[PDB]
């Protein structure tokens, strides 16, 4: 229990439950409520609301609260999270692309941001002072993911709709303002063979997922795949463990803080939890109870690696406990359209930015004072967390 864990700490000392946190905080998950102030509508160029997709927190020092967001018109807006003022949240706005943005990534430990777009290019931004450092080019189709390794800030990799995977180095020669691929993995996820999500486990190990093949692959970047002359062979390959015979494809990849476990949403509405530090290729836990019908649905982990929050096409965000998959999930109702690219705040356990297709980027915060003193009816709170039954 939560109270007993806190009570016993002074006498017994620190005890390791398995996750980063020293206390079980699954009891307070029902207190998540999003106020009416956090209903930011990402308005388009014409003035009509536009669905935002892809929105992540930052990591620069003294700025671990800014939440970027992108939409279908290429608008990228930085949002303050701790402050409470509707017009004060948008302190930075610009046109990243003219053909939407499909992913975002903050440079670790720095205030630099990269956008993955349908323009078959990826821009490098300095959000500290608005400017375009460079525009990486080389993909033959629309990009779909950008990943930064937290152990190496100057190296990032992208995975496009065309199907090949290229890793860039910002320290390389600028040439004529266009960055060039350092290593390229041609045909990484062949059976429209799009690489749905790319991810960086370590400074060298890279993890990828496919939209059609349905096998997670782990590549090491020490070797050069540009001159492979055949289909590259991954160092490790987590085979598809489900039962459906249809050609499936994963939509999101997520690791914990230690980088051992991997969570991968799939088209079968399951979130398989693999382990990448052992010989057990088979999944450890099977999270289910949502509807992962669309590839846009993404997930994120709690800062203490104790809870997994994922989007769904049933207009709700689901939070399972990472240690007890059998328990019913906590459902964050409040949206009328599907919920995509949910981002739990890594620098604050309280904040959960439930990013949505409803043209409303909601920021959910813990409300332990449920009794409080006023009620404000249902106008004040627009999102209510409830355990699924």
């Amino acid at each position: 229990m939560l109270f007993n864990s806190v009570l016993r700490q002074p006498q017994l000392g620190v005890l390791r439950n398995g996750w980063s946190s020293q206390y079980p905080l699954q009891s307070l998950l029902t207190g998540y409520q999003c106020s009416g102030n956090d209903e930011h509508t990402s308005y388009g160029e014409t003035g009509v609301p536009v669905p935002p997709f892809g929105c992540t927190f930052s990591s620069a020092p003294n700025m671990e609260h800014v939440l970027a967001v992108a939409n279908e018109e290429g608008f990228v807006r930085l949002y303050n999270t701790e402050s409470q003022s509707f017009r004060k949240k948008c302190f930075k706005e610009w046109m990243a692309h003219w053909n939407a943005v499909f992913d975002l990534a903050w440079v670790p430990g720095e205030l630099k941001l990269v956008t993955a777009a349908g323009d078959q290019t990826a821009k490098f931004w300095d959000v500290k002072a608005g400017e375009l450092i460079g525009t990486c080019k080389g993909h033959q189709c629309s990009l779909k993911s950008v990943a930064f390794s937290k152990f190496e800030k100057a190296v990032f990799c992208t995975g496009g709709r065309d199907g090949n995977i290229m890793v860039w180095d910002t320290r390389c020669n600028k040439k004529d303002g266009f960055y060039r691929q350092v290593n390229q993995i041609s045909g990484a996820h062949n059976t429209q063979q799009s690489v749905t999500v790319v991810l960086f486990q370590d400074e060298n190990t890279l993890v990828s997922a496919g939209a059609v093949d349905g096998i997670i692959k782990v590549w090491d970047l020490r070797k050069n795949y540009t001159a492979y002359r055949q289909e590259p062979i991954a160092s490790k390959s987590f085979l598809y463990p489900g039962s459906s015979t249809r050609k499936l494809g994963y939509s999101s990849l997520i690791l914990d803080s230690t980088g051992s476990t991997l969570f991968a949403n799939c088209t079968d509405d399951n979130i398989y939890m693999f382990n990448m530090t052992g010989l057990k290729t088979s999944p450890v836990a099977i999270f289910n109870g949502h509807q992962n019908s669309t590839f846009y649905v993404k997930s994120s982990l709690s800062p203490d690696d104790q809870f997994l929050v994922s989007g769904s096409s049933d207009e709700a965000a689901y939070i399972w406990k990472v240690s007890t998959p059998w328990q019913p999930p906590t459902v964050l109702l409040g949206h009328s359209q599907e919920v995509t690219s949910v981002c739990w705040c890594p620098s604050d356990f309280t904040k959960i930015a439930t990013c949505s297709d409803d043209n409303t980027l909601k920021i959910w915060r813990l409300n332990r004072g449920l009794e409080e003193k006023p009620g404000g009816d249902k106008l004040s709170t627009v999102g209510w967390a409830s355990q699924k039954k």
């Binding site: 946190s21 051992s260 057990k280």
Partner: protein, 1117 residues
């Protein structure tokens, strides 16, 4: 913010233990790792003999001893909590003792979850490699080659992610592991034949089996039997090939086994610890076969009596058994072959102190000297207690002692076989036939006059200087060799003698006397009008009573006239303050420089610095004492002479290098005393009190056992009682009600009461359920007996407790915040803030004030009380109707466990939202969030250092200091709390408390540090976090860097890495926190090495400056 963290008391909780031949191949050793410290002992016949203790630069988490082929003495392997593996070899090069490091290096991995059940470190029985299970799904193997100086470990991936315990099987021709892993099918035991050649696991010698569902550890049986022993909670199993036998002893079902140790080298007998202190013995029957190996017959357990809550068991030589404890004293029991009483074979021999889990702490002074003493709620469970920690070191009603002296009637034994005890009108000689004490007055000494001095002169012929007469009498010759009577025949209040010279001053008459055996000549008869209350002649050193310089005091101002011997002329006039005549004037010499103490009648001491070169009165630093007269005299402790003052607060003036320490010895009241190092009292001087004749580390610890876990403490000066919050644990009875396991301090409480609250009139307890009962004890401050015990409601816990005056009520109140917790509820829903008042021997519940939520913390606030009501900070005003009333609510916290206040600022430490600074607006009447720390820190304790500095304590053994960002703007920029301090303490901080254990008494000596904050930890460590200035902080940072460059750690671990702010999410270098141990270690270094640190930087930057800085800093500690 610049602070100074020093350790007042080293950690005492025992983490692990190991035995072997470390110091040498013949003498047995016992190694104890008390967190950051390592203690090496030698097990002699009489018990442990301390040899060497070294402070490892890390939290020792793995301790193993191995003997590689080709080595004489065993090597030591230590792996810290931050993964700094190292191999240590004892090396006693001559009288000097040092621990060299054969290998070192990190073993941390960038990828990999830190595994559950802690770090497991195992070493092959053949001693060819080291295996560590640091991370889930990995098994680090460190080859033990002589050329592996950097500990080049290699990972080995294994399929079983969750491993409970790993052990190395004995007798295998190849290295073989044996572990109990867990998979959804259930706990299993599977062995692997690891090979260094291929660096990969292979198939195990025997098939994997399905063990009991709660198998917790593995025991590797040695060569004669082989195999592994898998003890769980209910059953004990033995696995070796096809052989498998199991037992189900009911004696172990009560509570789970934790610790184990091998007794016999053959592995026939095994010890087993327990939660409840039980010490089982696991016998292994031997069944010799006709031609095969000696197979086992059956396992058999036995109960060998109850002991301390065991964390390590180590069967030493003979029958003694060391039992280390983390929640109590780590005793050293003895396994008697025959049962003595109650069926217990263990008899405790030498209980070792351990402050243990300091849950709460308070600073008070009982004798009222301004020097507080720590009163900690130490211990837990059955071994909870209440330690009285205080800094610094025979009642027989008799009249005032006019003189005491060692009458060495022995020829040369240097034993006070006789002691001339003198009163105003009587005098009796205390004959001491060894340790005997009897009064037989010697015929050679009179008793009709109040004797003032009875020292020796020469040829072993004593003197006896009485009042109104002087009568030298030889004792051993038993002849009156000299009976020079006093010509003035007045009370000889001053009688100075040393070696073969006596210079007496009969009131106001100095005489130059060459007092020798059979030679008592009155050469001079100088007489002045001014009275001479005190005067003494002392040689400069080895010279036989030769003192070229002398000093004489005055009356109007007591001007210590100093005259140059070659001239007898005026060089520099000296003037001193003080109208009252001094009680005693003493020339003191501990170092090269001399100090002339001036003990006045008011207690003020002016120890002028007398010099053989000059003799001029140095600076007049004043050390105050009580109004009782103070008498100063030299006392014999070591080869170097020392003085021992006597007053209402006796102080041992044990001066260090170029500094005079006035530490208070633990004596109630002393005015007259004589030195004594006899066999009866080797360390206790013959110490007469004001009216009673009595005879006699720096951090003295008293123990008040409670037999239950204390939670919080507080002091009440009005009632002169404490407020301990011990909580008993009693098993539910089979026929209803509860039955206590043992009689605790709560049960044996005179005049105990039971709470009768009717607030909760709205949970089922099984026969085997262990319900906890929480009581509020009241402990007298003098006798420490439990004056009251108010048992609370059923299923009600007590968390917070304060004693403070509320509102306008003059009565001092006892306020306790409780919290009802049912087993099904994750968090308490109903609580109570009940206020008592210890009127006279009883507690009356004045008010109840039912609240909705747990009351995690409480503290007085400007005559009002505020409580943290389960993530809600509420402020209560004490109405004249004697009822708490709500005010100043604040719903912006998540489990606001910790509250601290200073003025109108509240520091509400949260559970994971770091520290929040609240402010009470008087005229508004509402709380205001002035500032809030934003990065999550998982707080464990908080403290308000100053109006801006806010100390914190992360649960990851990391200290940090917040500070209000003044240089900003109000709108969201002044609300930012910016972290300044970062420091890896290495201990879990439980409580913070102001005050210091060192006396001040208005000692305005320009203290470099400001304030003092003592903290207690789980391991029993007590720190003294202070505040430094900018210049001193920079100087100490430079000193720390230079010492790190010079001082070599025992484990080759960098200090900057050890002190870095380590967390699973971030790792920052230490900032704004000067380590105290490292700076204080500068004193112990040799002069040629200290010159290396000193060279090339203040202005001169020479070793005297740095030495005086470090000596001034170490005084607070």
């Amino acid at each position: 913010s610049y602070n100074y963290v020093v350790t007042a008391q080293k950690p005492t909780a025992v983490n692990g233990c190991v035995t072997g031949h470390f110091t040498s191949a013949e003498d047995l050793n016992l190694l104890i790792a008390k967190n950051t410290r390592l203690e090496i002992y030698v097990v002699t016949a009489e018990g442990l003999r301390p040899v060497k203790e070294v402070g490892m630069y890390g939290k020792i988490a793995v301790m193993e001893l191995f003997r590689p082929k080709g080595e004489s003495k065993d090597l030591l392997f230590i792996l810290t909590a931050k993964y700094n593996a190292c191999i240590l070899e004892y090396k006693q090069s001559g009288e000097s003792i040092d621990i060299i490091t054969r290998a070192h290096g990190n073993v941390q991995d960038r990828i990999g979850r830190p595994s559950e059940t802690g770090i497991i470190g195992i070493i092959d029985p053949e001693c060819r490699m080291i295996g560590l299970r640091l991370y889930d799904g990995l098994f680090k193997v460190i080859p033990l080659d002589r050329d592996n100086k950097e500990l080049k470990a290699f990972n080995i991936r294994l399929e079983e992610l969750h491993v409970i315990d790993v052990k190395f099987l004995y007798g295998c021709q190849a290295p073989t592991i044996c572990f109990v892993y867990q998979d959804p099918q259930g706990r299993h035991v599977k062995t692997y034949e690891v090979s260094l050649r291929e660096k990969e696991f292979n198939k195990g010698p025997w098939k994997q089996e399905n063990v009991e569902a709660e198998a917790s550890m593995v025991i590797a049986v040695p060569e004669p039997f082989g195999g592994a022993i898998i003890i769980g909670q209910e059953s004990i199993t033995y696995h070796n090939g096809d052989k498998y036998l199991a037992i189900a002893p009911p004696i172990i079902k009560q509570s789970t086994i934790v610790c184990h140790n091998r007794v016999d080298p053959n592995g026939s007998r095994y010890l087993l610890g327990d939660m409840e202190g039980r010490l089982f013995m696991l016998l292994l029957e031997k069944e010799e076969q006709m031609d095969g190996t000696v197979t086992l017959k059956d396992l058999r357990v036995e109960l060998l009596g109850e002991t301390s809550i065991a964390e390590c068991l180590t069967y030493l030589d003979n029958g003694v058994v060391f039992v280390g404890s983390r929640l109590g004293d780590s005793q050293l029991v003895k396994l008697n072959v025959d049962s003595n009483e109650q069926g217990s074979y263990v008899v405790a021999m030498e209980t070792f102190t351990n402050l243990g889990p300091i849950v709460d702490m308070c600073v008070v002074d009982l004798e009222r000297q301004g020097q507080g003493q720590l009163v900690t709620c130490s211990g837990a469970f059955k071994e909870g207690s209440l330690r009285i920690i205080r800094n610094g070191i025979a009642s027989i009603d008799l009249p005032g002692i006019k003189g005491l002296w060692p009458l060495r009637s022995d020829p040369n034994r240097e034993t006070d076989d006789t002691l001339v005890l003198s009163f105003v009108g009587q005098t009796r000689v205390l004959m001491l036939n060894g340790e005997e004490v009897e009064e037989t007055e010697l015929m050679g000494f009179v008793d009709d006059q109040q004797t003032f001095f009875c020292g020796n002169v020469a040829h072993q012929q004593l003197i006896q200087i009485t009042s109104a007469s002087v009568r030298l009498v030889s004792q051993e010759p038993k002849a009156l060799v000299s009976e020079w009577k006093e010509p003035q025949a007045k009370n000889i209040s001053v009688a100075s003698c040393n070696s073969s010279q006596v210079v007496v001053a009969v009131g106001r008459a100095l005489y130059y006397l060459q007092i020798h055996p059979q030679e008592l000549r009155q050469i001079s008869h100088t007489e002045m009008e001014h009275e001479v209350a005190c005067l003494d002649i002392t040689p400069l050193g080895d010279s036989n009573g030769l003192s070229p310089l002398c000093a004489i005091g005055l009356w109007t101002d007591i001007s210590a006239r100093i005259l140059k011997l070659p001239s007898f002329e005026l060089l520099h006039k000296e003037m001193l303050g003080g109208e009252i005549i001094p009680r005693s004037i003493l020339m003191t010499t501990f170092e090269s420089s001399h100090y002339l103490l001036c003990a006045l009648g008011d207690g003020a001491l002016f120890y002028f610095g007398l010099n053989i070169e000059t003799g001029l009165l140095s600076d007049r630093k004043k050390v105050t004492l009580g109004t009782q007269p103070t008498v100063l005299r030299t006392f014999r402790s070591l080869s170097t002479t020392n003085v021992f003052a006597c007053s209402d607060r006796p102080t041992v003036i044990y001066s260090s290098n170029h500094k005079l320490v006035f530490s208070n010895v633990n004596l109630k009241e002393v005015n007259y005393m004589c030195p004594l190092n006899s066999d009866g009292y080797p360390d206790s001087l013959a110490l007469a009190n004001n009216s009673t004749l009595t005879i006699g580390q720096k951090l003295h610890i008293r123990t008040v056992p409670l037999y239950e876990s204390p939670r919080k403490i507080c002091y009440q000066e009005v009632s002169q009682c404490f407020g301990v919050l011990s909580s008993r644990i009693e098993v539910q009875d089979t026929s209803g009600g509860t039955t206590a396991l043992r009689p605790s301090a709560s049960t044996q409480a005179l005049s105990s009461s039971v709470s009768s609250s009717k607030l909760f009139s709205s949970h089922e307890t099984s026969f085997g359920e262990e319900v906890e009962v929480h009581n509020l004890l009241i402990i007298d401050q003098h006798t420490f007996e439990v004056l009251h015990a108010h048992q609370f409601l059923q299923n009600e816990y007590a968390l917070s407790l304060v004693s403070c005056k509320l509102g306008k009520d003059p009565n001092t109140y006892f306020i306790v915040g409780t919290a009802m917790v049912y087993p099904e509820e994750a968090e308490p829903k109903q609580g109570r803030i009940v206020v008592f008042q210890y009127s006279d021997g009883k507690l009356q519940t004045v008010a109840e004030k039912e609240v909705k939520g747990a009351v995690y913390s409480m503290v007085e606030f400007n005559g009002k009380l505020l409580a943290s009501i389960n993530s809600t900070v509420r402020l209560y005003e004490w109405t004249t109707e004697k009822e708490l009333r709500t005010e100043c609510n604040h719903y912006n916290n998540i489990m606001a466990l910790y509250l601290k206040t200073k003025g109108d600022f509240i520091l509400v430490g949260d559970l994971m939202r770091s520290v929040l600074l609240l402010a009470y607006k008087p005229m508004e009447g509402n709380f205001e969030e002035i500032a809030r720390d934003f990065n999550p820190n998982w707080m464990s304790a908080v403290e308000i250092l100053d109006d801006d500095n806010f100390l914190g304590a992360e649960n990851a053994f990391n200290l940090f200091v917040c500070q209000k960002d003044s240089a900003a703007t109000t709108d969201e920029e002044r609300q930012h709390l910016q972290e300044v301090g970062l420091f890896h303490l290495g201990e879990f901080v439980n409580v913070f408390c102001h005050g210091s254990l060192v006396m001040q008494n208005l000692g305005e000596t320009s203290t470099p540090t400001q304030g003092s904050v003592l903290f207690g930890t789980v391991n029993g460590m007590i720190g003294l976090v202070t505040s430094l200035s900018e210049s001193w902080y920079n100087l100490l940072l430079d000193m720390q860097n230079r010492l790190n460059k010079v001082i070599k750690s025992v484990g080759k671990i960098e200090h900057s890495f050890w002190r870095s702010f380590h967390t699973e999410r971030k790792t920052e270098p230490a900032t704004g926190f000067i380590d105290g141990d490292l700076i204080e270690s500068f004193l112990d270094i040799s002069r040629p090495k200290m010159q290396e640190v000193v060279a090339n930087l203040k202005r001169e930057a020479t070793a005297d400056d740095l030495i005086k800085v470090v000596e001034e800093l170490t005084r607070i500690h």
